[PDB]
Amino acid sequence: VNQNAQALNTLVKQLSSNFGAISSVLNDILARLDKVEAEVQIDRLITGRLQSLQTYVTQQLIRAAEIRASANLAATKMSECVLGQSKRVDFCGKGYHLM
Amino acid sequence: VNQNAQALNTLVKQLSSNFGAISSVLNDILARLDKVEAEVQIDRLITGR
Amino acid sequence: VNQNAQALNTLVKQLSSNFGAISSVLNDILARLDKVEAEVQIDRLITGR
Amino acid sequence: QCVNLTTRTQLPPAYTNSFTRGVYYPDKVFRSSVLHSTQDLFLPFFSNVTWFHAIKRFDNPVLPFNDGVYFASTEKSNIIRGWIFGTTLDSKTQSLLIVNNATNVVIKVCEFQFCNDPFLGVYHKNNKSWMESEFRVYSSANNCTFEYVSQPFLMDLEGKQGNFKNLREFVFKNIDGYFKIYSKHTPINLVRDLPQGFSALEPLVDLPIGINITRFQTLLALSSSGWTAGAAAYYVGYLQPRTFLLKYNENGTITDAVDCALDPLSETKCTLKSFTVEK
Amino acid sequence: QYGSFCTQLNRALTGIAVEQDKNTQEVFAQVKQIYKTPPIKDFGGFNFSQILPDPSKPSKRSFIEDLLFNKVLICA
Amino acid sequence: GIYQTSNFRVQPTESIVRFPNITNLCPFGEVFNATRFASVYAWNRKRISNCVADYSVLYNSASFSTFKCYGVSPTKLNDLCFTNVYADSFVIRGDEVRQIAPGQTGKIADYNYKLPDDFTGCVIAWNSNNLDSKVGGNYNYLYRLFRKSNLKPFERDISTEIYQAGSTPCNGVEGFNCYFPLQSYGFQPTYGVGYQPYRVVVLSFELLHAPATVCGPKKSTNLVKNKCVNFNFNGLTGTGVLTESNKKFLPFQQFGRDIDDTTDAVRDPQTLEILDITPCSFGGVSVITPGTNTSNQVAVLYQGVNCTEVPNVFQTRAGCLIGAEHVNNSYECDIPIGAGICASYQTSQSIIAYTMSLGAENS
Numbered sequence: 080v081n082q083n084a085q086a087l088n089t090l091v092k093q094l095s096s097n098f099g100a101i102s103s104v105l106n107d108i109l110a111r112l113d114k115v116e117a118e119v120q121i122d123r124l125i126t127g128r129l130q131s132l133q134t135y136v137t138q139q140l141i142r143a144a145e146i147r148a149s150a151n152l153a154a155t156k157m158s159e160c161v162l163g164q165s166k167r168v169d170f171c172g173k174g175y176h177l178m
Numbered sequence: 179v180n181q182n183a184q185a186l187n188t189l190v191k192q193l194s195s196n197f198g199a200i201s202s203v204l205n206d207i208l209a210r211l212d213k214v215e216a217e218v219q220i221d222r223l224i225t226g227r
Numbered sequence: 228v229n230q231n232a233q234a235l236n237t238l239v240k241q242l243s244s245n246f247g248a249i250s251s252v253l254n255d256i257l258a259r260l261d262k263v264e265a266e267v268q269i270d271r272l273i274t275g276r
Numbered sequence: 277q278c279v280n281l282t283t284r285t286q287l288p289p290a291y292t293n294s295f296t297r298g299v300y301y302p303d304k305v306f307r308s309s310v311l312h313s314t315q316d317l318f319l320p321f322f323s324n325v326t327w328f329h330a331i332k333r334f335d336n337p338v339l340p341f342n343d344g345v346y347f348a349s350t351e352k353s354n355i356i357r358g359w360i361f362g363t364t365l366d367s368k369t370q371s372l373l374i375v376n377n378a379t380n381v382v383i384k385v386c387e388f389q390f391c392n393d394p395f396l397g398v399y400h401k402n403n404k405s406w407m408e409s410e411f412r413v414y415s416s417a418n419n420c421t422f423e424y425v426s427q428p429f430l431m432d433l434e435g436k437q438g439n440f441k442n443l444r445e446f447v448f449k450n451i452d453g454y455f456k457i458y459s460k461h462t463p464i465n466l467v468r469d470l471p472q473g474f475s476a477l478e479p480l481v482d483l484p485i486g487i488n489i490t491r492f493q494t495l496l497a498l499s500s501s502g503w504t505a506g507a508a509a510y511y512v513g514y515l516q517p518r519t520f521l522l523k524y525n526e527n528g529t530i531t532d533a534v535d536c537a538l539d540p541l542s543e544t545k546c547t548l549k550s551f552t553v554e555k
Numbered sequence: 556q557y558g559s560f561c562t563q564l565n566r567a568l569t570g571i572a573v574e575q576d577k578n579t580q581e582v583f584a585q586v587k588q589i590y591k592t593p594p595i596k597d598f599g600g601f602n603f604s605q606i607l608p609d610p611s612k613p614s615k616r617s618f619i620e621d622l623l624f625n626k627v628l629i630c631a
Numbered sequence: 632g633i634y635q636t637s638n639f640r641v642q643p644t645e646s647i648v649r650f651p652n653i654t655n656l657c658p659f660g661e662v663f664n665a666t667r668f669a670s671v672y673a674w675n676r677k678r679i680s681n682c683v684a685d686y687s688v689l690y691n692s693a694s695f696s697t698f699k700c701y702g703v704s705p706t707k708l709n710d711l712c713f714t715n716v717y718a719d720s721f722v723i724r725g726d727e728v729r730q731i732a733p734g735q736t737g738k739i740a741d742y743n744y745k746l747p748d749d750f751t752g753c754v755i756a757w758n759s760n761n762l763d764s765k766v767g768g769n770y771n772y773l774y775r776l777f778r779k780s781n782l783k784p785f786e787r788d789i790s791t792e793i794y795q796a797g798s799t800p801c802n803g804v805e806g807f808n809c810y811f812p813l814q815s816y817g818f819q820p821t822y823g824v825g826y827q828p829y830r831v832v833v834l835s836f837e838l839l840h841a842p843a844t845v846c847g848p849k850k851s852t853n854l855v856k857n858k859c860v861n862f863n864f865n866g867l868t869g870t871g872v873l874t875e876s877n878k879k880f881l882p883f884q885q886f887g888r889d890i891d892d893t894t895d896a897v898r899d900p901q902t903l904e905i906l907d908i909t910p911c912s913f914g915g916v917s918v919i920t921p922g923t924n925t926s927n928q929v930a931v932l933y934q935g936v937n938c939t940e941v942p943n944v945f946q947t948r949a950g951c952l953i954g955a956e957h958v959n960n961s962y963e964c965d966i967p968i969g970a971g972i973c974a975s976y977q978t979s980q981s982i983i984a985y986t987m988s989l990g991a992e993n994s
């Protein structure tokens with residue numbers, strides 16, 4: 080939970096970086112600059128925040144593949160260890176296994 | 179099979195995006211402009227693709 | 228061991244590429260342009276590396 | 277109209293350990309139960325603050341001014357009355373004068389012809405009245421670029437208590453062509469030690485100056501070679517650029533502060549954005 | 556202009572969510588009929604009091620389960 | 632299955648543009664119409680604060696020659712509110728007016744007067760050949776020629792010390808490689824463009840570091856509550872609902888952040904009420920459906936949105952599910968809704984939503 084919640088904190092914090100523009104408030108440059116020239120500024124934020132979101136998605140895919148290998152090693156221990164007696168040394172416990 | 183075939187469709191379809199340029203065809207921006215100043219447009223396609 | 232050492236070697240070589248700027252020496256763009264507009268070149272390198 | 281004075285106990289300054297004092301609200305916005313990290317000019321924790329007396333004894337040096345100043349007076353009857361600020365103090369630059377009349381403060385950003393050793397002569401007459409008959413602060417004010425007067429607050433000016441409750445702290449900054457004054461007051465039942473513990477600094481006022489301040493000297497009320505004055509002492513500390521982390525409470529008062537360059541553990545606290553470092 | 560990045564990201568995250576649901580389903584649903592321990596507890600002399608579900612409780616979590624649950628902002 | 636589409640959001644109702652209390656007009660006319668302008672090395676500086684501005688009359692007039700705004704757009708200076716304004720006035724040879732823009736090199740841009748890389752104000756220059764130019768020589772206009780080093784932004788220098796150019800120490804008021812650093816221009820009615828004088832004014836202005844001070848049109852409206860509307864309290868656009876807040880705001884407090892980055896509860900000008908701002912209700916709809924080879928009636932799940940505020944409703948811990956009836960029966964899960972609720976299509980025929988049954992019971 081700590082590692083998971085330590086990503087959204089970084090993600091939301093990224094909404095406070097100008098990425099080179101004049102201001103990181105998207106309702107500021109829209110209400111301070113004209114139409115034709117604003118997109119020069121507004122584009123920089125998109126290319127920034129898009130990278131910010133892409134990195135967060137990729138990390139999840141990798142992390143969600145670490146858990147998938149622990150929900151399969153648990154769905155196995157739940158089968159030999161519980162519903163039977165396991166002779167796989169040091170799999171269920173430490174020593175000769177009973178239940 | 180469905181999952182893999184879904185990636186290439188998006189990958190190929192991405193060739194038809196402006197990415198901020200004035201076309202989506204390299205020749206369209208190579209047959210309508212000279213070389214010294216049209217690199218800016220081709221610049222925006224490379225980083226995009 | 229080979230596969231790992233192949234990653235770092237490629238990584239260091241990427242310090243010799245212009246990424247569209249004028250040169251790959253960060254102590255060179257400074258000593259050829261003025262301060263106000265040479266920022267644009269340095270920005271490409273950062274987005275690059 | 278200026279009289280030189282030497283009724284002074286010639287002594288060298290003292291040194292004191294400014295433990296955890298001098299934290300002021302940098303931004304005007306409101307927070308609650310958050311740990312923000314900021315970088316600004318503060319008074320570094322655990323510094324050597326310079327200590328002067330003001331009772332016999334008469335201290336009035338003119339001290340250098342850079343990066344603002346943290347001026348803290350433990351005062352009975354608060355004989356201190358004002359400050360001057362400038363670079364030459366001889367009607368050659370826009371001098372700042374913050375005389376605090378008993379009626380109210382008066383702010384004079386005007387070129388001023390001061391004295392060589394000016395001091396507020398508020399006349400040794402011990403008959404329950406000290407009618408001032410000496411404006412011994414400056415001679416002329418050809419010019420006057422700014423003239424502000426605050427609310428007419430009438431502060432106490434008498435007492436001979438053994439445990440001086442009145443501690444008054446001020447911090448003066450000068451940046452972006454603006455003069456900034458933050459200050460606070462507390463009743464302290466101590467005697468001489470600068471009160472260990474933590475506090476805050478409610479902002480007082482920010483005004484425009486656009487002047488090059490590099491030197492200053494306090495002012496205090498007072499015959500010339502003979503007087504009766506209440507006990508007072510004051511501390512001067514020099515600010516510095518630094519980086520802190522703070523802990524605003526639910527009310528919004530700054531409850532605690534943490535340095536970022538005092539010692540390694542402070543650096544780890546500053547990095548983790550947490551006040552409790554685990555093994 | 557940037558094309559179909561949004562759909563890509565949404566597909567990825569939705570896939571993660573469904574995979575999580577399948578993970579829990581696969582770990583726990585190993586049995587098809589929910590059994591019920593008899594009210595009699597003559598298990599030879601083994602005191603199963605701690606782990607068997609606790610009746611006098613809001614939920615069915617036993618003692619150890621609730622201890623673990625106790626052991627282990629959003630609006631922004 | 633259950634598909635996800637079309638994230639929704641509630642829409643704003645009206646606007647609120649309450650600005651600070653009204654005051655008198657700004658004396659910009661005085662600054663531009665001043666009888667005597669100074670020189671570049673002694674540019675005239677003035678501060679503008681605590682007045683109702685007006686930039687339409689400033690801009691629309693043909694009384695100006697060239698106008699360039701570097702941080703804003705001239706069409707809507709009449710909406711913003713500013714911390715403070717600085718007006719800087721002088722007169723320059725026309726050919727060098729091009730160096731007023733920041734980030735350039737030039738005799739009036741290297742040694743006497745500067746701008747920063749982060750400029751925000753607007754430059755306005757105007758020809759004054761008719762008045763400035765004199766027949767007999769109006770050479771009171773002096774300007775810096777040499778500097779030991781270039782000066783920083785807005786670093787006025789008045790020193791007239793004789794500058795040393797060579798190895799020998801600069802002695803006396805003059806000498807070899809010793810020069811008076813100031814030179815007078817040439818301005819006469821016989822001159823043409825490029826050498827005519829131009830009166831140049833710079834209107835810099837800075838934002839948000841104090842309570843707003845300079846504004847334009849007022850049209851204060853109201854402080855309505857619990858209504859998704861727009862607001863402009865001091866130059867801070869947005870959208871959301873408003874209410875009285877019990878937060879402890881010391882005298883100098885507004886613009887709460889309170890966790891990460893958001894413009895949380897704020898007070899307002901013209902009154903002292905500590906309001907609040909929370910964004911309008913929003914969430915993601917979802918569509919539950921049996922296969923289109925079976926029927927065409929569907930249900931809709933408004934996620935995380937109280938049924939009451941959504942405009943066969945059955946609120947479930949997931950969200951407001953509309954279109955299906957809640958049976959007390961417990962069946963197997965077919966189209967998983969969530970939070971322990973599963974839908975299906977049963978027999979007339981309709982879509983139902985019920986509580987999942989973890990198999991059967993067998994003692």
Ligand SMILES: *[C@@H]1O[C@H](CO)[C@@H](O)[C@H](O)[C@H]1NC(C)=O
Nearest residue numbers: 291292293321322323324325
């Ligand atoms: C304070 O001054 C004393 C004497 O000069 C010195 O020994 C001590 O290290 C100083 N402490 C600080 C905080 O610099």
Ligand SMILES: *[C@@H]1O[C@H](CO)[C@@H](O)[C@H](O)[C@H]1NC(C)=O
Nearest residue numbers: 377378379380398408410411
């Ligand atoms: C302020 O103080 C000065 C010096 O004590 C005195 O001359 C002056 O009359 C006082 N003014 C008021 C308003 O009391």
Ligand SMILES: *[C@@H]1O[C@H](CO)[C@@H](O)[C@H](O)[C@H]1NC(C)=O
Nearest residue numbers: 525526527528529877878879
């Ligand atoms: C501070 O906030 C707490 C919790 O809201 C409240 O109980 C307490 O009275 C407040 N104190 C003051 C003086 O604001």
Ligand SMILES: *[C@@H]1O[C@H](CO)[C@@H](O)[C@H](O)[C@H]1NC(C)=O
Nearest residue numbers: 651652653849851900901902
């Ligand atoms: C402005 O000030 C007056 C006097 O305090 C007050 O009545 C009014 O409501 C304020 N707002 C306006 C009228 O713009």
Ligand SMILES: *[C@@H]1O[C@H](CO)[C@@H](O)[C@H](O)[C@H]1NC(C)=O
Nearest residue numbers: 659660661662663664689694
């Ligand atoms: C100068 O004064 C005239 C007459 O009052 C006025 O029409 C003109 O707008 C003024 N110019 C400025 C903006 O200083």
Ligand SMILES: *[C@@H]1O[C@H](CO)[C@@H](O)[C@H](O)[C@H]1NC(C)=O
Nearest residue numbers: 936937938939940946947948
């Ligand atoms: C929906 O709003 C009503 C008030 O209109 C409230 O009583 C109800 O509890 C809300 N829904 C919840 C919190 O489940």
Ligand SMILES: *[C@@H]1O[C@H](CO)[C@@H](O)[C@H](O)[C@H]1NC(C)=O
Nearest residue numbers: 945946956957958959960985
């Ligand atoms: C069945 O569910 C509905 C809706 O929750 C409820 O009103 C009704 O009383 C329930 N009936 C039974 C038999 O529990």
Ligand SMILES: *[C@@]1(*)O[C@H](CO)[C@@H](O)[C@H](O)[C@H]1NC(C)=O
Nearest residue numbers: 367368387388389417418419
């Ligand atoms: C006072 O102002 C006049 C204005 O002409 C100036 O000449 C004089 O030098 C000024 N005096 C001081 C001490 O600033």
